């Protein structure tokens, strides 16, 4: 069973730094995605590995 | 998209009280499931509603 958390909650509990590192992105991108409220969710695998995906309703608007 | 969190992480971030209340269980049951390490995950719906389920590999051992 995977865990699945929003980018914002994840960063809030673990810190921007660790989040950036976990995803391998340039740190400031984290801060910007949050502040822009995008719909990004991280999946935490059982082996501890992490990936992110942006999710939108289909269809659109 | 649902969020999905372990009982332990959920209680840790929100407090045992709110967890009990969220699930509608007798408070001390929370504490006992944790300390016994059962494999319990909460699903947080978009409308904000919460449910829990215990999960085991199939097949067994």
Swiss-Prot record, chains A, B:
Gene3D superfamilies attached to this UniProt entry: CRO Repressor
Stated role: Plays an essential role in the switch from lysogenic to lytic state and in fine-tuning the lytic phase activation. Mediates the de-repression of the lytic promoters from repression by cI at an early stage of prophage induction. Turns down the expression of the transcriptional activator cII, a factor that initiates the expression of repressor cI, the major component promoting latency. Additionally, cro is able to directly bind to the promoter region of cI thereby preventing the transcription of cI repressor.
Recorded superkingdom: Viruses
Keyword Transferase attributed: no
SUPFAM superfamilies found in the cross-reference section: lambda repressor-like DNA-binding domains (SSF47413)
Keyword Transmembrane helix on entry: no
Protein's GO biological process: latency-replication decision; negative regulation of transcription by competitive promoter binding; negative regulation of viral transcription; release from viral latency; response to UV
InterPro entries attached to this UniProt entry: Cro-like (IPR000655), Cro_sf (IPR038202), Lambda_DNA-bd_dom_sf (IPR010982)
GO molecular function per UniProt: core promoter sequence-specific DNA binding; DNA binding; protein homodimerization activity
Species of provenance: Escherichia phage lambda (Bacteriophage lambda)
Pfam families for this protein: Cro
Keywords, sorted A to Z: DNA-binding, Early protein, Latency-replication decision, Repressor, Transcription, Transcription regulation, Viral latency, Viral latency initiation and maintenance
Regions recorded as binding DNA: 16-35
Protein name per its UniProtKB record: Regulatory protein cro
Subunit organization: Binds DNA as a homodimer.
């Amino acid at each position: 069973m995977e865990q699945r958390i929003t980018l914002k909650d994840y960063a809030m509990r673990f810190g921007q730094t660790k989040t950036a590192k976990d995803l391998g992105v340039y740190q400031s991108a984290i801060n910007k995605a949050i502040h822009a409220g995008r719909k990004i969710f991280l999946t935490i695998n059982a082996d501890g590995s992490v990936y992110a995906e942006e999710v939108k309703p289909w269809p659109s608007n």
